[PDB]
Amino acid sequence: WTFSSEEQLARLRADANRKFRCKAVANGKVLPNDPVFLEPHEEMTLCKYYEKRLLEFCSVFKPAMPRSVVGTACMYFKRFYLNNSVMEYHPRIIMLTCAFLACKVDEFNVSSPQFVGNLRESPLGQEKALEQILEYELLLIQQLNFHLIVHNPYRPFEGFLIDLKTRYPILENPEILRKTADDFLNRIALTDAYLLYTPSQIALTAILSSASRAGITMESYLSESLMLKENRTCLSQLLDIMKSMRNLVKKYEPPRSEEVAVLKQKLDRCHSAELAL
Amino acid sequence: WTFSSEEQLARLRADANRKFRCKAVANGKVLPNDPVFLEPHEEMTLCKYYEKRLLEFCSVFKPAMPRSVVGTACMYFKRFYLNNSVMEYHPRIIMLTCAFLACKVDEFNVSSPQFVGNLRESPLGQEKALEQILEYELLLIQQLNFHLIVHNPYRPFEGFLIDLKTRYPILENPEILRKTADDFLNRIALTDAYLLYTPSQIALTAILSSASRAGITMESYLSESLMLKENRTCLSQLLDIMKSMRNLVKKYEPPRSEEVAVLKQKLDRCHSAELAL
């Protein structure tokens, strides 16, 4: 569950898209080239959109949801779709299933009625969503190969922040660093970076690249402090990895208002006709 | 998930009982020798009772539930409690969670509202049960070590029945054999036999021991047909294994009406006071 390239994820996602196309066509009600089907690239936009809808949900989640939970939930959502089609299991539901499962896994103390209680729908509407999470729970757990422990960036982040503040007492005002570094971490979390690097490299990139966004530079930081090494890197590599992630977020295209509007409708029209009977 | 003795399961169950006692006592509200706690032997009675309540539920389950499902569900229930206390997770709920998970795992086509629809409770009461299954789903899956595939006796049973009817055309009236052998299989399913032997040995014992209950004896059956061997046994062992299971069901003490009434009340009084805060 930590891959070697954007190409490797591209392939997996493509496979998932074909597998459904073939299943749908196999179950007769549609021709192989029917434009009802979403293209891998279209699935992606919808996933970007839902991952954002996922983030919003967690942000407003009244019983204040810890960042370990929101991070875990997003990792699930991503991994699910590396080999599953948006056309087969609706991401509106899978998204909410990832949040719930994540609360359970991370032992975040919240009951299901409390959880669905955070949805802007009538009491029965919310009960209905609770029902759908029961439907997809095992599916989600199975599609994750039963590997539910996900290591988030927030832990090594707090550690790097600690390292800096005691090592460079000048910046004893990290309250500014943290907020910036958090903003940047959120952007990385929206790319495939979580599936591509260690959470430490991810935490490190958020901090060094945010302090730097601020102007300040600790030219002796990596060398002096990080003579130590936990996640594979003779300094140089790390510098390239940071350049790599820093690039990923630079080239991240957010879902656009209207395309989503179209693709949602396609996705809805897809779940509408029995393609999966 | 196939053990070497009733002693091995006895130990596991005992451990589970102590672990809770210690957790409860650790969380202060109770003394180590408080009679509120159930003894391992008492847990057992309650489990026998619930496994029967489990069987009844599946029997009346309107969208006719296949025997693979009911068998799988009972295996879960048993395995859950090999290392978990009835005092900690109520078997009324775990029982229903095992049924649901089993429908999902075996791909028995039934939705959650359909499932809970089979409970003799008001619409909200049933929704409440659906909620509790969502609560315990992951727990159940985790406590099963993520091993959800359970091989039932019904498959090799149908095969042995086929073997007999073509090999001894006299008994071409197996409709009688089957019903008897099924009745006996139900009795084995209530003992630890499922956790102790292969489903083939279990299927074989149900058939050979039921034909025999009927009077008829095929002295050339094992030797002539079963020169073949899939599950460890130089004839002799098998004969001893059949003697073993045949013994287990002989010495199975069903839960008694009033003791249950008491133990339920103890169990309820247990879940009543916060022992698990």
Curated annotation (Swiss-Prot), chains A, B:
A Pfam family annotated for this chain is Cyclin_N
A single Gene Ontology CC annotation of this entry is: CAK-ERCC2 complex
Residue numbers bearing the Phosphoserine modification: 122
Q: What is its main location?
A: nucleus
Tell me the keywords, alphabetical order: Cell cycle, Cyclin, Nucleus, Phosphoprotein, Transcription, Transcription regulation
Q: What Gene3D superfamilies does the database record attribute to this sequence?
A: Cyclin-like
State the InterPro entries in the record.
Answer: Cyclin-like_dom (IPR013763), Cyclin-like_sf (IPR036915), Cyclin/Ssn8 (IPR043198), Cyclin_C_2 (IPR031658), Cyclin_N (IPR006671), CyclinH/Ccl1 (IPR027081)
Q: Does the entry feature the keyword Transcription, yes or no?
A: yes
Give the UniProt subcellular location, in the record's own words. Answer: Nucleus
MF-aspect GO terms: cyclin-dependent protein serine/threonine kinase regulator activity; kinase activity
Question: What S-S linkages are listed for this chain?
Answer: none
Keyword Phosphoprotein applies: yes
According to its UniProt entry, the protein's GO biological process terms are: protein stabilization; regulation of G1/S transition of mitotic cell cycle; regulation of transcription by RNA polymerase II; transcription initiation at RNA polymerase II promoter
Q: What does this protein do?
A: Regulates CDK7, the catalytic subunit of the CDK-activating kinase (CAK) enzymatic complex. CAK activates the cyclin-associated kinases CDK1, CDK2, CDK4 and CDK6 by threonine phosphorylation. CAK complexed to the core-TFIIH basal transcription factor activates RNA polymerase II by serine phosphorylation of the repetitive C-terminal domain (CTD) of its large subunit (POLR2A), allowing its escape from the promoter and elongation of the transcripts. Involved in cell cycle control and in RNA transcription by RNA polymerase II. Its expression and activity are constant throughout the cell cycle.
Which family is this protein grouped under? Belongs to the cyclin family. Cyclin C subfamily.
Assembly mode: Associates primarily with CDK7 and MAT1 to form the CAK complex. CAK can further associate with the core-TFIIH to form the TFIIH basal transcription factor.
Tell me what this protein is called: Cyclin-H
Q: Cite the source lineage.
A: Eukaryota, Metazoa, Chordata, Craniata, Vertebrata
